[PDB]
């Protein structure tokens, strides 16, 4: 069995290495707002479809929804578990999903007849810590857990629709697609797997990183994505080609990546690092031209659906919007 | 108009400020006992498929929140979330004791727990007293047990050969990775059932925050 698996892996490597056929400038993204009000370290954020509202989670156990233009705090939600490693914002804007170390994903209904943001669903069934959750629709949500298994849930039923198994290490992040048919997800086994939502099975596996993947994003095209890991290197993996493209890394960076995101055009790959600073790259050439200077480890990153601005969070309790 | 949205934001920041006063007072602790260690025993005495099993108590008028770990076998990633805790709390049964030394040393000299002190609890030394007296010899597991000699005074009421092993494991833990300055071990002897566990945490945390204050004011 092992000899056959090794032969299959060698054949796969040869097939994905068979062909191998083949300047933005200083961005100087200036901060415009500074959403202060979080009492503990920031873990994850998510923008809105309207490109105006955003949501952030803190180690205090607070999920705060900000109006980015006018800096106002639209909502403040107290979480049941203080340890939250991810948060989401529904595409329709009616729901927010927070997941963390409590192994349970909480879906809160923003738009309700009452004036309080109450939890619509408590999706339980995962074993390891939740590290990334993203909405497909108001009905179904895909969640990444630390028990080496991703999941797809139907919210009203409250039960797992499909379970995505195959990872060896704890899965840290997942990224959807514009069409929402396939989603990529990276884990601690130094691999990122493309999974098919409908069939509930792994479609592809991408390797090449030295250490565990701590953040994943997905190119707006639908046929590419990018990963960020703890070995201070980012890589762009083609989805339909199953290969490794140019690697965004520098010899002056010794700290890993905590978050990754893209610009709407896809010409800018933004990367929130650990050295108190978020860097930028030209995703088609991997050149660091611009730095988004916080006072602590940048833990989260987001770009509006219209590309208006980019918000960066960090463990200094602050969330800064840059244009 | 829009001004009412600003008033709503101000009234939400008002609640955020009133919750900041509660986030500062409470002292966060992380419990990282072993699999066989009696950390369940020490969290059982709290009268004083989930994830974190939080437990809130208060020694005197100071509130501590101990975060225990439930169904999380690798900790290389969910540990960094506890960078802001006041202290780590190990529980060890003092052969599975070597694994306790290994993961204890690995928790030390990390990248995210560089500014966090550690409180050792040597639980279930009630069995250690009989182990030292009888058959089971720590010499096979640790060659330096025979060479090691006891002179800090132990608790009276026990044989000199039963309180001589305690200091061996205590020394082994305190020089495991503490001796590489910002944080140091605080070894203890938790035995099986003692009601002084909370005080050993209260005084320990008081010492920790006092040292932190001295370092900020440059008293040291």
């Amino acid at each position, epitope marked *: 069995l092992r000899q056959e698996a090794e032969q299959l892996k060698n054949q796969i490597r040869d097939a994905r290495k068979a062909c191998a056929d083949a300047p933005v400038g200083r961005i100087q993204m200036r901060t415009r707002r500074t959403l202060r009000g979080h009492l503990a370290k920031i873990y994850a954020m998510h923008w809105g479809t*309207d490109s*105006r*509202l955003l949501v952030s989670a803190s180690q205090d156990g607070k999920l705060i929804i900000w*109006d980015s*233009y*006018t800096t*106002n705090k*639209v*909502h403040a939600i107290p979480l049941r578990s203080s340890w939250v490693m991810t948060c989401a914002y529904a595409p329709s*804007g009616n729901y927010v999903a927070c997941g963390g170390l409590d192994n349970i994903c909480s879906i809160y209904n923003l*738009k309700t*007849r*009452e*004036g*309080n943001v109450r939890v619509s669903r408590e999706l339980a069934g995962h074993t390891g810590y939740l590290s990334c959750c993203r909405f497909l629709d108001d009905n179904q949500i895909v969640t990444s857990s630390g028990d080496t298994t991703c999941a797809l849930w139907d919210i009203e039923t409250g039960q797992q629709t499909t379970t995505f198994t195959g990872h060896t290490g704890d899965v840290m992040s997942l990224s959807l697609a514009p069409d929402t048919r396939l989603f990529v997800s990276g884990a601690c086994d130094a691999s990122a797997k493309l999974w098919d939502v409908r069939e509930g099975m792994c479609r592809q596996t991408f390797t090449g990183h030295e250490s565990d993947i701590n953040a994943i994003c997905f190119f707006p095209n639908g046929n590419a994505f990018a990963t960020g890991s703890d070995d201070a290197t980012c890589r762009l993996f083609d989805l339909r080609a199953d290969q490794e493209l140019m690697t965004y890394s520098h010899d002056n960076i010794i700290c890993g990546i905590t978050s990754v995101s893209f610009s709407k055009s896809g010409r800018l790959l933004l990367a929130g690092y650990d050295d108190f600073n978020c860097n930028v790259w030209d995703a088609l050439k991997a050149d660091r031209a611009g730095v988004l200077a916080h006072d602590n480890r940048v833990s989260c990153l987001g770009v509006t659906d219209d590309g208006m601005a980019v918000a960066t969070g960090s463990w200094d309790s602050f969330l800064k919007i840059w244009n | *108009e*829009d*001004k*009412a*949205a600003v*008033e*709503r934001s*101000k*009234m939400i920041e008002k609640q955020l400020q009133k919750d900041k006063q509660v986030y500062r007072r409470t002292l966060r602790l992380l419990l990282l006992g072993a699999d066989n260690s009696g950390k369940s025993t020490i969290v059982k005495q709290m009268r004083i498929t989930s994830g974190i099993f939080e437990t809130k108590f208060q020694v005197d008028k100071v509130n501590f929140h101990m975060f225990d770990v439930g169904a999380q076998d690798e900790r290389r990633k969910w540990i960094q979330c506890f960078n802001d805790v006041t202290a780590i709390i190990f529980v060890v049964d003092s052969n599975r004791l070597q694994e306790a030394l290994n993961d204890f040393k690995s928790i030390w000299n990390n990248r995210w727990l560089r500014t966090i002190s550690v409180i050792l609890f040597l639980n279930k030394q009630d069995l250690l007293a009989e182990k030292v007296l009888a058959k089971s010899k720590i010499e096979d597991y640790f060659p330096e047990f025979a060479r090691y000699t006891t002179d800090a005074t132990p608790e009276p009421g026990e044989d000199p050969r039963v309180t001589r092993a305690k200091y061996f494991i205590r020394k082994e833990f305190v020089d495991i990775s503490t001796a590489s300055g910002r944080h140091i071990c605080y070894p203890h002897f938790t035995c099986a059932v003692d009601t002084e566990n909370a005080r050993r945490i209260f005084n320990d945390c008081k010492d920790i925050i006092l040292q932190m204050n001295l370092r900020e004011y440059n008293l040291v």
Partner: single-chain antibody
Amino acid sequence: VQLVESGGGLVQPGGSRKLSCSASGFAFSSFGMHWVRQAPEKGLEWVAYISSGSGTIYYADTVKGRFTISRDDPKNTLFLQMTSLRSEDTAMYYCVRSIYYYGSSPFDFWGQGTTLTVSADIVMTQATSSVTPGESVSISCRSSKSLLHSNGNTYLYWFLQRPGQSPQLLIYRMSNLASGVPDRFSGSGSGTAFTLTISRLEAEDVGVYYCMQHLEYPLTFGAGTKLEL
């Protein structure tokens, strides 16, 4: 989400009465509260407004020194006390819920209401008060000033008070319709001239339609178009 108004009765002119609005079914502590007057033979009119935590209060220019508003969040109740009741303060008073944040729907829910027996602001007018079920109808409204703000909002509200029941909301900020209303109401305008279009027409669309502005703090209503079909 239900608000029960209490008060009313036969009151001699010059007296004092404290009307109440008990709210239950929502987070009253987070929703600004208005009062809206409606004369028996006239349209609606604004009375007073109190913020969520009573940090800001506005009063109508018609009566300002005789009216007082208050709220009790722990009991989730609202109070409006009136003194020296003139011959004009003998109308139908509605306590209105309204929250303000981005994307919100102020004036979303209106209370049941209680009866009573005894300048430079923007003025909103309507072409007439009258307009067969099954075909599209249009209602025209006019404002004395551009209601479109610099941010982009056009503070126009449509209510459609149906006979025999309290008013509701059709469309807030001109363009965005309410939640529970059928998706057959639409609104458009240029800033001063407005039009509300209803595609179908059923036994529920019959009633008087109102036209409210929220740009400036005084909240002046329209006249009301009575659609009989």
